Each structure stands twice: as structure tokens, then as C-alpha cells.
Design an enzyme around this catalytic site. Structure first.
Site, PDB file in Angstrom:
ATOM      1  CD  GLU A 236      -3.001  -1.254   2.243  1.00  0.00           C
ATOM      2  OE1 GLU A 236      -2.924  -0.493   3.245  1.00  0.00           O
ATOM      3  OE2 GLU A 236      -4.013  -1.980   2.163  1.00  0.00           O
TER       4      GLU A 236
ATOM      5  CD  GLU B 197      -4.063  -6.043   3.333  1.00  0.00           C
ATOM      6  OE1 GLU B 197      -4.984  -5.348   3.823  1.00  0.00           O
ATOM      7  OE2 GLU B 197      -2.864  -5.816   3.424  1.00  0.00           O
TER       8      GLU B 197
END
Length: 394
Positions: free
Chosen positions: A186, A286
């Protein structure tokens, strides 16, 4: 070791192990609470290790590292029908910056985990979850509220740490277990220089291949729109074995939280339709069963929940208290959750597969594969459907 074209990834993240996250292991952070005052609780691993000092931090983490995930969990993951695990790790396990408070020793457990994966026929991704200076300011990067990955020499140090991970885990020793090395979890696209981030991705890609490695390179989408990476690291430029990791959640904003269950399912199905159009192999690295942001400290230590209108200026939707314990969930919340999980599983299986965040939590049921499976909310076997074909994929 894996056929991205033919096989489907069915895994779980081993979160909260090598990178502490307050909402996943609140017991390691709670001792710092003074009655109801949360102002002295360290907000991230960086501050947690700094406040404890090297000696106590190493003793507490050695105990955490040796009991949080053991060989028995890998057996259990395999017995549940899963074939893969994603393992987050911070840069500090390999190198410390001068003055860093972090302690080391995670590597010994990483290496034990790779042998457990091998014994149980589980494949793995090694994910660099935190870089020096922080790539996103999230507590899961190790350092909250800082965005300096692109300042000073932080990008070069990240590349040096990746070179180490490439030489140790991208060679022949783990070629039968390691099916991907994720360059950086991320990176927060909107606050970074995208041109420098692409150059960093290209440098890591070239460095790995230069070692003679054929391991797939995993790039996180950096919160960009679907298709944004279509023209980067392509077979037309002789760049191969590249996978795009997409993370999907619907609880981090007031707008997303207010959707009714039908709209949440429509958005999940849409993730399946848009990912199918991308040109790179892609996996939902995720996602969870969460329909609220109620887990204590999910938004960070000392931050409330948008769900009950206590954070990020969101409107009140409902009380969180009653959702903290799965045994207190109404029959409708249980059905909504199962429907949500099944819609997501169909959408992600439509492309490369999925990796649920996470295997376990101390007491946050929406984020624990174990808890949802034991309470009958997560399909078992995973192909089981109580709400078949909610998306209508063709």
C-alpha cells in the site's frame, strides 16, 4: 510452483505477526492505558518498541513471535482447504536505520514458517509491509502519520532491503514455496510522486531478475483505479511474471459504510467484473467480512469509529458495542455477513483468487478467518454457498 493461469489462490494473511497492529493484538497495547485515558498508548510498533526499550521489547516480541502463529496453524490452514498464505514483514527485520528503536529476530520465524508451508503444501508471498519513513502513514507500516518513503535515502534503503530479500528468498532454495515477492504494501498513491514510485517498482523488478530469479513480482495497486497498471511491466517490453495485488474493503468512509447490504454486494460483484478486464494477472491480496469499522483501534490507537459517528466526521449509523462479540450478533447481521463473504469469494475467484485479512485476531471477529469459520459464517468447505450466484458472472 504455481500456475497463475490455471490455479486459484485461496489464502489468508498472517497479519499481526511480524508487524504489530493495535486492533489485532490489543493486549500488547492495553497495559499502557491509564484507566480510560488512551493518550499514553504507543500508536505503532515504532513507538511501542521505543517506549519499552530494547530489552523488554525483545522479550515481549520473542514470546509473541513464538506463540501467535505456529506449525499447528499451518496444518489447520491446510485442513480448511486453503493453499496459500501472504506474510507481511517490515524492513527492520533486515536492516535498521541509525536510531531506529525496532528489534530484530523476525527472520528466524520467517524461515521456520517457510518450512511449515512446505510441509503442509502451502505456497507463499513475502510482502514488504513497511518501508523506512513510511510509504503511507498507516500504523501497519510501522510508523503512523509520516509519509517520508520518498525523502532522503529512504527509497534506496528500501531497494537494499529488497535486494536482501531477493537473494535469500527468490533463489532455488525456496522455489517450491515462494510464489511471489511483493515489493511494497500500500504505497499511498495520492500523496506520493507516481513517477518515482513507478521507477522504484521498475528498479525492484530489474534487480530481482538480475539475480537469476524467476519468482513472480507482486505490485500493490497503490490505490489507483482498475486498469491503471495495464501499460506498466508488460510482456510487450519483455517484463514477465508480474501480478497486481488489489485490496478491497467497504468500511473506511462514511459513504461506503452507509450502503445497505444489497449495495455492498453490488460493489463486491463489480470488483469481479472490473478486475476481469485488466491485462495483468491479479489477486485480491486483502479483504474481510467487515461491514463496519467498529473493531477497537481499527482506525488507529485513540481514534473512534465512523460507524457510530465518532471519527472522520461521519454520520451515526448504529452502536458498535453490540457488534464487538459474535455471540451477540443478530440473526440478520449473521446472514448479511455470510452473503457479503460469498459475493466477495465469487468475484475474486473470477480472477486470480483471494487472501483474507487475516487468519486471526485477539477478539475482532469481522477480521478473523478462524472465528468466522468456527461460527459458520465463512463457508466450509470454501466452495459452499448458501446464497448462490449473487453476481451472475459468465
Amino acid at each position: 510452483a504455481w500456475d497463475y493461469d490455471n490455479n486459484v489462490i485461496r489464502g489468508v494473511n498472517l497479519g499481526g505477526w511480524f508487524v504489530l497492529e493495535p486492533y489485532m493484538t490489543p493486549s500488547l497495547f492495553e497495559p499502557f492505558q491509564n484507566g480510560n485515558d488512551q493518550s499514553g498508548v504507543p500508536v505503532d510498533e515504532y513507538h511501542w518498541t521505543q517506549t519499552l526499550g530494547k530489552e523488554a521489547a525483545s522479550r515481549i516480541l520473542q514470546k509473541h513471535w513464538s506463540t501467535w502463529i505456529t506449525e499447528q496453524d499451518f496444518k489447520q490452514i491446510s485442513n480448511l482447504g486453503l493453499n496459500f498464505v501472504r506474510i507481511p514483514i517490515g524492513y527492520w527485520a533486515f536492516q535498521l536505520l541509525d536510531n531506529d528503536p525496532y528489534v530484530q529476530g523476525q527472520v528466524q520465524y520467517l524461515e521456520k514458517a517457510l518450512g511449515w508451508a512446505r510441509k503442509n503444501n502451502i505456497r507463499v508471498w513475502i510482502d514488504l509491509h513497511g518501508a523506512p519513513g513510511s510509504q503511507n502513514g498507516f500504523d501497519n507500516s510501522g510508523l503512523r502519520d509520516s509519509y517520508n518513503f520518498q525523502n532522503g535515502d529512504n527509497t534506496q534503503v528500501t531497494l537494499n532491503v529488497l535486494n536482501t530479500i531477493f537473494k535469500k528468498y527468490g533463489g532455488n532454495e525456496y522455489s517450491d514455496v515462494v510464489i511471489g515477492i511483493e515489493l511494497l504494501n500500500e504505497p499511498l498513491g495520492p500523496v506520493l510522486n507516481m513517477d518515482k514510485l513507478k521507477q522504484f517498482f521498475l528498479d525492484g523488478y530489474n534487480s530481482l531478475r538480475q539475480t537469476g530469479s524467476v519468482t513472480p513480482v507482486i505490485i500493490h495497486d497503490a490505490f489507483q483505479v482498475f486498469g491503471y497498471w495495464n501499460n506498466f511491466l508488460t510482456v510487450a517490453e519483455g517484463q514477465w511474471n508480474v501480478v497486481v495485488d488489489h485490496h478491497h474493503y467497504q468500511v473506511f468512509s462514511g459513504g461506503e459504510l452507509s450502503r445497505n447490504i444489497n449495495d455492498h454486494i453490488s460493489v463486491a460483484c463489480n470488483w469481479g467484473w472490473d478486475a476481469k478486464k485488466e491485462s495483468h494477472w491479479n489477486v485480491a491480496g486483502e479483504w474481510s467480512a467487515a461491514l463496519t469499522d467498529c473493531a477497537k483501534w481499527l482506525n488507529g490507537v485513540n481514534r473512534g469509529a465512523r460507524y457510530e459517528g465518532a471519527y472522520d466526521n461521519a454520520p451515526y449509523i448504529g452502536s458498535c458495542q453490540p457488534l464487538l462479540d459474535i455471540s451477540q450478533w443478530s440473526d440478520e447481521h449473521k446472514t448479511d455477513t455470510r452473503r457479503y463473504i460469498e459475493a466477495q469469494l465469487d468475484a475474486f475467484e473470477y480472477t486470480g483468487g483471494w487472501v483474507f485479512w487475516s487468519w486471526k485476531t485477539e477478539n475482532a471477529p469481522e477480521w478473523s478467518f478462524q472465528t468466522l469459520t468456527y461460527n459458520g459464517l465463512f463457508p466450509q468447505p470454501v466452495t459452499d454457498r448458501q446464497f448462490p450466484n449473487q453476481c451472475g458472472f459468465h
